[PDB]
Amino acid sequence: QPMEEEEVETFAFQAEIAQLMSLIINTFYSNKEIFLRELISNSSDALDKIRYESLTDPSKLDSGKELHINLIPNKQDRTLTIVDTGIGMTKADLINNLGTIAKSGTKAFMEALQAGADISMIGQFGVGFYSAYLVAEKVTVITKHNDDEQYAWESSAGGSFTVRTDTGEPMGRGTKVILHLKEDQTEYLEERRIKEIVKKHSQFIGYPITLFVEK
Numbered sequence: 001q002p003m004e005e006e007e008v009e010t011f012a013f014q015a016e017i018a019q020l021m022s023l024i025i026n027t028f029y030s031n032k033e034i035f036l037r038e039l040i041s042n043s044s045d046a047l048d049k050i051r052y053e054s055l056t057d058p059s060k061l062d063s064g065k066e067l068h069i070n071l072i073p074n075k076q077d078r079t080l081t082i083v084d085t086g087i088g089m090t091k092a093d094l095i096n097n098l099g100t101i102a103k104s105g106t107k108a109f110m111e112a113l114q115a116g117a118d119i120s121m122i123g124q125f126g127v128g129f130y131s132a133y134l135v136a137e138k139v140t141v142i143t144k145h146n147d148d149e150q151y152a153w154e155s156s157a158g159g160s161f162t163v164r165t166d167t168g169e170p171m172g173r174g175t176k177v178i179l180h181l182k183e184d185q186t187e188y189l190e191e192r193r194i195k196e197i198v199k200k201h202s203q204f205i206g207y208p209i210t211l212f213v214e215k
């Protein structure tokens with residue numbers, strides 16, 4: 001094929017977010033399983049946003065009426081994908097919300113964690129997404145909002161992330177978080193383990209979850 005050209009935007013994480021990511025990555029924490037509760041909570045919040053906004057404007061569901069979460073472990077590529085049909089993010093929302101803008105709870109959470117707080121407290125500080133780095137060496141976030149095109153965000157930490165127009169499979173609306181798991185964290189690809197953690201932490205979320213198991 002003749003050479004194709006793709007635009008990439010590389011961003012630096014806000015200094016404190018980068019400090020938090022390094023703390024989560026480079027330090028042992030027990031109870032890493034809470035990463036799933038945090039991502040399912042973000043999906044649930046996104047599904048509430050489109051649900052309430054569609055009450056006033058039902059055409060916001062032209063990109064899909066079904067409001068749900070799918071969990072997709074892939075043992076071949078060692079990824080766990082969390083997909084929702086929530087509100088999604090515009091490119092601007094994605095750049096702002098996933099690393100460039102200082103988050104209110106970052107400083108406070110780092111002090112709490114170092115003082116011996118369990119990693120489980122992360123969600124209360126509004127930085128729960130970053131718990132993905134307890135189990136993943138790389139995270140890819142694919143998102144589609146009614147007001148913009150589909151975008152792919154990705155980071156292996158190291159203080160930067162990239163954003164590009166997604167060349168992958170289009171989604172009607174919502175967000176897909178792809179966790180590229182660390183070699184020692186493959187238990188999160190096991191259906192019994194995923195079911196255990198969803199029953200323990202994610203029972204009252206408001207939307208149906210479906211776990212897709214590879215035969």
Ligand SMILES: CSc1nc(N)nc(-c2ccccc2Cl)n1
Pocket residue numbers: 039042043046084086087088089097098129141175176177
């Ligand atoms: C606003 S739509 C949305 N959907 C999901 N699943 N997650 C998020 C989110 C919120 C904060 C930080 C990172 C993400 Cl990916 N945002």
